[PDB]
Design an enzyme around this catalytic site. Structure first.
Site: not given
Ligand SMILES: *[C@H](O)[C@H](C[C@@H]1CCNC1=O)NC(=O)[C@H](CC(C)C)NC(=O)OCc1ccccc1
Ligand SMILES: *[C@H](O)[C@H](C[C@@H]1CCNC1=O)NC(=O)[C@H](CC(C)C)NC(=O)OCc1ccccc1
Lengths: 303, 301
Positions: A41, A146, A148
């Site tokens: 992603h 950030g 990931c």
């Molecule tokens: C990917 O870099 C990252 C991991 C999340 C960021 C917040 N804490 C993490 O572990 N962010 C993402 O937004 C991830 C990507 C999707 C396309 C799978 N989505 C996600 O984690 O959604 C849940 C979320 C996002 C932001 C804050 C709290 C939960």
């Protein structure tokens, strides 16, 4: 107790971490031989994360859509000469082989197993910690925006077994990622939608190891002569939100060193699940399943 | 909670670990510049760890008594060209400066503060974990025979602050060691005899940070309008096995983000200490003092 959350020294893995940038999105990658792995992603526009079409995004990319940078140690901008998608991961082929590539393998971790995590932001390692793969295929980690592409691994000898690349934070506070074959742990999907998560369980083998650690520390009040067979315990576990117990040589070592049979601890768990009767075990009033038989063997007995 | 025990990445410190052998005793050393630091009891035969005359042992050593070997990275055998004793540590001078020497300082860590430990055996790094310095100046580590000279540290930007070299396990499960000025933490001596262990206490600033971590995760059932001043709490703390609270800018940041005053959480601690009355806070029924204000700020920004 002498039991701590112990991670592997992270130096070998720090030298493999890079930053991967594609368009506006930026995250972490793992640089091994001529390949850089990162979450797919990174291709996706920040305003399209719920319903991305990763196949169409892939088609729209060229080698030049990907910027790969190593800021740690010897800095370098790596030239991407090929790109492929495998499940939830990209494989970016680069023109330079990582001179610091350790001996490594790829492997999948199973529930109850522990591994070390190197948390990274913008290609820079920032911390390390150890987690257990939960029976619902989440980990209780510490990941922010950030992170990931942050990497999880065990080490056998001098060999690093990469087992996890971080992708996602669930509605509760937990986290999940991909194995390096690209499949997400637990059939979550890497899209920003609300997804149901399985219910967690106690890792029976880990509770057993922990009670052996209490015994090794002289804390044996819960031990009684009564026993429960593995078969009957496992029938009991399915009705009480425990994983089934599967013996290993590591557990056998703890039984032989302590003189307490596995079945005695299985009977103990059935009683302790009802309540600790005021008393505690290794400073805890609840069962603990975050330490493995291997951890108890290594940390308490140096095996 | 987003809370885990996180240590620093250990690569920079891994490049500074060596093995130090003297006679039939072996353990680890820290190689910075031309100096190798290690616990002085390397000089002591194992049958005499009970009452060692380190003055006399040191007298009888020569430069050739010490063998220093680097196993990690580019392997090397370093010539010792001088040896000195500073408190409970030896400072060996070797002929070549560690080319991997990071930017560093030496500091002492205070009760309640967390630091990372690189556990080593025979000069080979084998694990890393984080600990809080307890009020009785022990740490709840994981160390076995051969781990002495393992090193504890914090990292400020690009600077590593070395604060701990491992020395001993006490009768209970805990561990202690030296600062790099050679002084042992908290009244212990590097002699293998049973010694008086002072009483541990809860680190109130860390309980406060943990209660703020709970609030940040929507677990605020314990918050009331009631307040206890810092002064009143500290008088109460001396009576109930708690450290005195001293506020910091890090705690203030949590008070401001959540809008819950420090003095509210101090009242809360006093009630919670008598029991949670079957309730739970982030999955525990006892107070947690292993996470610092800084941990909460960084891990739960
Ligand atoms: C990917 O870099 C990252 C991991 C999340 C960021 C917040 N804490 C993490 O572990 N962010 C993402 O937004 C991830 C990507 C999707 C396309 C799978 N989505 C996600 O984690 O959604 C849940 C979320 C996002 C932001 C804050 C709290 C939960
Ligand atoms: C140095 O390698 C060693 C580390 C101890 C070994 C057991 N776990 C540890 O952390 N320190 C000592 O052996 C120390 C030497 C004195 C002269 C300071 N003695 C000691 O810790 O005695 C306690 C003890 C020894 C062996 C096993 C369990 C406890």
């Amino acid at each position: 107790s002498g039991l701590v959350k112990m991670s592997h020294p992270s130096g070998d893995v720090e030298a493999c971490m890079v930053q991967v940038t594609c368009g506006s999105m930026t995250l972490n990658g793992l640089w091994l031989d001529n390949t850089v792995w990162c979450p797919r992603h990174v291709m996706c526009p920040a305003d399209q994360l719920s319903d991305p079409n990763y196949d169409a995004l892939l088609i729209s990319m060229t080698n030049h859509s990907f910027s790969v940078q190593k800021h740690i140690g010897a800095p370098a901008n790596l030239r991407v000469v090929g790109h492929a998608m495998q499940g939830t991961l990209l494989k970016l082929t680069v023109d330079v082989a990582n001179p610091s590539t350790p001996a490594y393998t790829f492997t999948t971790v199973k529930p109850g197993a522990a591994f070390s995590v190197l948390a990274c932001y913008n290609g820079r390692p920032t911390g390390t910690f150890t987690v257990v793969m939960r029976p619902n295929y989440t980990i209780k980690g510490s990941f922010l925006c950030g992170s990931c592409g942050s990497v999880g691994y065990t080490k056998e000898g001098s060999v690093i077994n990469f087992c996890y690349m971080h992708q996602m934070e669930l509605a509760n506070g937990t986290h999940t990622g991909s194995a390096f074959d690209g499949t997400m742990y637990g059939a979550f999907m890497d899209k920003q939608v609300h997804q149901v998560q399985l219910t967690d369980k106690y890792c029976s083998v880990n509770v057993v190891a922990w009670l052996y650690a209490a015994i090794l520390n002289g804390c044996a009040w819960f031990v009684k002569p009564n026993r429960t067979s593995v078969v009957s315990f496992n029938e009991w576990a399915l009705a009480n939100q425990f994983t089934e117990f599967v013996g290993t040589q590591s557990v056998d070592m703890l039984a032989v060193k302590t003189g307490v049979a596995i079945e005695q601890l299985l009977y103990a768990i059935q009683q302790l699940y009802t309540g600790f009767q005021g008393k505690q075990i290794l400073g805890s009033t609840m069962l603990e399943d975050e330490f493995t038989p291997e951890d108890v063997n290594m940390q308490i007995m140096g095996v």
